[PDB]
Amino acid sequence: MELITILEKTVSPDRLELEAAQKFLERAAVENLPTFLVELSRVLANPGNSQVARVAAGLQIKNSLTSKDPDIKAQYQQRWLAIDANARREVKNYVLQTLGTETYRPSSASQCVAGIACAEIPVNQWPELIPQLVANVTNPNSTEHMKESTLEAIGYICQDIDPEQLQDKSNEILTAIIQGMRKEEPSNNVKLAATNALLNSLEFTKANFDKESERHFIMQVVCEATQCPDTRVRVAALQNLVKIMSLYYQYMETYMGPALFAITIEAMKSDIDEVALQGIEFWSNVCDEEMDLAIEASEAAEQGRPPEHTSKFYAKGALQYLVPILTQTLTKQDENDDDDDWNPCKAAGVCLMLLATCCEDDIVPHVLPFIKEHIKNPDWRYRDAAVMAFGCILEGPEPSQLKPLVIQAMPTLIELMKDPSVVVRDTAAWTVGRICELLPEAAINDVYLAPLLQCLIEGLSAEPRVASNVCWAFSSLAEAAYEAADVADDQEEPATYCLSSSFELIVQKLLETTDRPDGHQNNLRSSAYESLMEIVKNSAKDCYPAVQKTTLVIMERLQQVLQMESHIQSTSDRIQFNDLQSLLCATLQNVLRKVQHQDALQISDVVMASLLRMFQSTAGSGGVQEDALMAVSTLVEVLGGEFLKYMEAFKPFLGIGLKNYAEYQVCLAAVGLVGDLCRALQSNIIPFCDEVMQLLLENLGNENVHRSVKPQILSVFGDIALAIGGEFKKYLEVVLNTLQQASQAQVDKSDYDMVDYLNELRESCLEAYTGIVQGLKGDQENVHPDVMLVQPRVEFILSFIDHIAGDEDHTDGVVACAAGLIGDLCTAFGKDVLKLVEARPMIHELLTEGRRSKTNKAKTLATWATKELRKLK
Template identity: 35%
Template sequence: MDIASLLETALMASDAATRNSAEQQLSQLAEQHYEEYMKQFAKVLLSGASVQGRILAALGMKNQLTSKLANKRIEQLNRWISASPATKATVKDAAIKVLLSDSPEMTTSISQLASAIALIELPRSEWPELLPIITENTKVSCPLNVKRSCLLAIGYICESADANDPAVIAQSNGILIAIANGIQSTEPLAQVRLTALNALIYSLQFIKENFQREGERNYIMQVVCEATQSPDVELQAAAFGCLARIVQLYYHYMSLYMEKALFVLSMNGMLSPNDRVACMAIEFWSTICEEEFEIAYQLHEQSERGEPASPDLVSYNFSLLACGEVLPRLLTLLTKQNEDPEDDDWSVAMAAGSCLLLLASSTGVYVVEPTLKFFATNIDLPEWRNREAAVMAFGSILEGPDIEQIKPAIQEAIQPIESLIRDPSIQVKETVTWCLGKITEIALSALELEKDLEQLLSTLLVGLSDHSKVSVNSCWALINLLEQLCAETQDEPTNPMSKYYENFVQALVLLSNKPNNEFNSRASAYEALSAFVTYSALDTMPIIQRVAIEVLSRIQSTISLQQQGLSIENRAQLEELQINILSLLTNIIRRSSSEVASAAPDLMNMFIKLLEAQEPNALIEEDVFIAISAVASALGESFLPFMDSFVPYLSQALRNVQSQTCVTAVGLVADLAQSLNSKIAPYLNGLMDILGLAILNNDIKRELKPAIISCFGDIAGVMGPDFMQYMDPVMQICADLTNLVPEDSSYDSMDYVSSIKEAVLDCYVGIVSGLSTKPEALVRFLDPIFLLIRHVASDIELSMNESAARSAVGLLGDVAAMYSDGQLRNYYAQDWVTEFIKKTRGNLVFSQQTKDAARWARDRQKRQIA
């Protein structure tokens, strides 16, 4: 069977076995004969095969060039780079020909293929003819689908490329010319202008130099502003979205444009009869508020650290200056809610509420008086939209002003808001409980609890038995109350919520037993029950014990259901329920740790049954492991009898390096080490072998590597000198990772490298702690330890990261304390050591604990260099 026929079969065959066989053959060809695969697919692309077959050919080649998995992406990049020039030329020529073929069906797939090639070649300064070809074919006179394909390709390239890659940035002029061709008002086809506008949104981060030039900047702003006035509403909406992105990236250039055009355009846009346009115009102001809040926050942080204000941190206070006009418009738009209470589609009212919250955050007290007037005018009106808008407005301004400034208003408004809990409108009741949630989250201090708490709780109790959306917010408000009123009362005889436990726990147990999870209401009830467990005082423990009995009964019932054989949909729903129950059970175990010993055999038997019954990669495995961790923590070394039956499941999860459960399993190994101490030794060889193989596997999930390194440190800390048998390979891995550099300049890559170095630091802390009585065993590893600390000291981000800085200076002190005075003079006399300790101790933002660690390090350093 030829390639075209295989593609047709893989796509169209009615028999699943036939389709799967064709897909496997194609996959084998790609794996074993890569270049032949690409050439044959390119041939299909240009052939008379069906449109579906040609689309599949384009996507098949694209999927061989890009992947969401970083390691896979690197492998694909290297395979393409290593391919012969003839093969690459064949594929690129085919891609260009189809890109320019004016085929509407191929537009998306061929632009994805062209961009996938470009994302490999442009950073290498290859395929120089691509952008000139694209630019030439975005002119007004070109066919519709050619222009769309070329502009889509630019959008895909800019969406995924590294914004700091100099080779891609060097192409910014060509990118901008092509986009300008498509976006300008002389382009007669709105579809082309829309595609160009979307491409511009993605390209904005690449055209910084163009934006710095006033003439080019003016032209970009002109064509985008013109697009807001197009009769095509999709184009209008995209234009306002583009303006929001421009404000986000280039706020410091916006003063003139705000004065000349942006203010008027956006204010008019908010009144558009088209909801999408209105929402995007509101989003423009939301972005302004976010940017100005961020500037104010950064200036405050710099002031707190005693640093001078950065000259590039300048706020034009657009939100404050426009508050008098923007605020009334937002308040009016709050009444444009969806009619159906169960319709969660983004609405103008939702956008206005979100913007009002941000406006309050950026302007503070200036929103208060107009909003309170709006609240008072609308709260009692017969139309439900006005009542809902009044409560939404009130809740949306709570995060901006100082609570003391609005304390009288909250005290005055709380009763009218609570009275609406029996309103005939579901939307009103939902917003009432949301507003009460906001008050309990950030403004509880404004209430007089002796007078207000009883009525507040009565309102929330009513809310629990109402519509699912109302009950969800009631649960959230209860969690906020427990966190704020009972955070430090677990060991107290009673707490402010104790006398309400009986009614609320009973209501939540009932709510959590509903047959469905409509609007996440059942999960919210379990979350609220967990909060009642976590923050329970001693006088409520009998109630918690009754909850425990109910929870164990429910989890046993789900196991029985699981054994009956369920459909995929029912199994997923059951797994979701089991996860909720397990989360609550885990909190009960933690809260009742002294009573876990007697129940441990039954608990572990139940957990093993759950693990046995799961499909591969089931989400519930993580939650079972977390529950087992809670049991181990409660039992300590008494957990040892359960290890033989559990370790096979733990080992299996550790080997499944592509599963999220593996990350949880690594954390569980660390927890078991902390619980069992040296009694984990009989199982350590097997676990360390699996962890060692995992960390050397290039296909593991990114977050797994730092988790494993930290886990090595936890094991070393409890095993002490007995960890020496693993020291050489572990220290070699740590030394290699100390020199790790980001694969590119993206935030994700740089953050990943920082997380790796923090994990190595944690590992060294554990190793040093474990060898504290054996300093002679550590001597040959001091060089890599000090090299890492120097990396931390010289890295701006890591040295300003408090946990990393505290660990690093603590490590300096601990190592010095292990050796007699002067023995490590050569290490501690280095200038960077003194400077790092001084910098950490003098950081105004760091906590006293970190500063004490720095003082300890300085004291031990002085002894070494005296």
């Protein structure tokens, strides 16, 4: 009937009544979307209607124009732009006019304004928008609601909108935001909305920050805001200071001394946890930026050039005053622990850690004294703090300075493992684990190993929060022991090592831990399996007897879960069966490694048989899960060509994994598996290639596929080409053009989330061409010549390389791949390639850069290629 009546029914607590209402609206939007929106906006815009109907209308509008789904979003945006400009004009008028006329707390108009703006701004279709929003805020006669709802609108636009679209109007946006944050502003609500919008907006105030006049204006408003009496504004302002430090570190030098240091140190000492957390994050974030600057400085030095950005070492300068604040905060442990909850105490530990790795040696002498003062304090809060701080500084300082300190700490640390406080024992295990990780020499000592091992063994039976760190400590100890034994001096793998004596007890104790009923708490079970896994890998040969037993137990468990999965009762059951299967399979990826290949075979056939059964039952019931595919890969690695026996049966399950493109993670694993099948089955994969190749190309048509699938599919094209050689001619044309296009992709660096998808995908392209050029040519030939079909493409591939050489943005993985390709071309097409290569000086420069190593063999490939071009002379 009436739109309003329907709208009010959408909030009914009755399922059917809520269904009728929703279907009415659905088909209305299908029968005449333009007229539906206009009517909806009229409801929203009229204060005469009930709050329920206005809010409901706002929701119908917003949902017609956006969605979390990027693809559906862009689609809704285009459906909007195609509507009569006059109808859209009317909707824009009403939505805009609703701002400030809502009694509702959070405005429903803000999100509609943003939804339409995100569509219309990139094509200048709503020139009226910005200047209207700016007027709403700056107008001294505007009500609190008008200003608040508007600032939220601004915020939603900066957040949802394409990043490239909003710089031409940053000047106006900032005028409104800054005006809304001024301290004279009577309403904290307005200040809060304004400050939240600033945060969303910083991404495009680049041109504004480059102007001292404006930069100075912005910093004063944010700093003053950190003094607002409304805690919500204080926190939001600090959040802005943190983001400003990440994007405009270059400009900060004039504000740190005179403002920021004091503001953020005061925030850290605040009794309001929300405030302390922002002060701490500010100084953890400075550590991150400065560690990144040090890498930039270091790389620029090896290039005989000064770095583009320089560090002012603020962490180093602040360190004196940071540490005493942070150690005290470590004293505020939350007695009821929640390994999923964040508080000042935990943030302080991370911050201390980052300071250790940022300022390295400097830090020791500021922390030690607190540690020695409190290591034996009767108050557990201080005893634990002391042990925590000790573990936080084990990475960063020169190991030569830490060793003596760690060795003299062992006796006390071993005792603390038996401390009456569970909180203390939790930290002792972590600190012990981090000693083993970072400074194993202290633990692999003829003095302390025996008693340390006794503590760790007993600790596996302790409470979850303690046993979990103990597990990690054990695996770390195992890795070190293994390495120590076989740096060298014996040959292929080590005959014995310091853990051999108790290897049996450890595995059985770990196998027990895996099975504890409270295993779900504190990530125990996973930690136990990770540890078992890591210790089986890192074991000496005189440990085989224990290794085999453990493998019989793992298969036993795996065989069990697998058949449990052809008889599922519930989606809870469904979920846990896969979680155990996941851990067991991952564990399998190390045991199969590490037996006799003869035995690995008997195990492989048995497991694959069980998985195929699980596949036959499990899925089409939500299946295929991904770790099962990775499980198959390791299984294909062992059976190699002997896997051909299961192809006819596995084939469909390969497909379903390839076809499933919505779960790019499953698809991805399916793609990689195809590559593994190529190297294993080789030529024998031919009779399967059509099906696969067809599914691959299909997927490439595209684009709600994930970014990340394409490069892998391209890489696999190369493998397929290597595996079937001449038989690839069938696909040659379509693939080359696909490569052609993907080569021309050229995202512009102001972004980095693209700079290293560009390289991820470029490398992929190079591996593709390499597999094709080598696939069509030859080993023990009769004559050669399929490759000649690609001959006409040489000019372009070289251009693609030349363009890669100019871009300072080289991943070593790419330089190498590009070098290997050049060498391939020389060996394939010969002395015509020379003229083309000497016509691009940048290619010469690319090879030299590869003749210096990073990595290893980028240098070999670059060395090889340089040689091939030389011999062509």
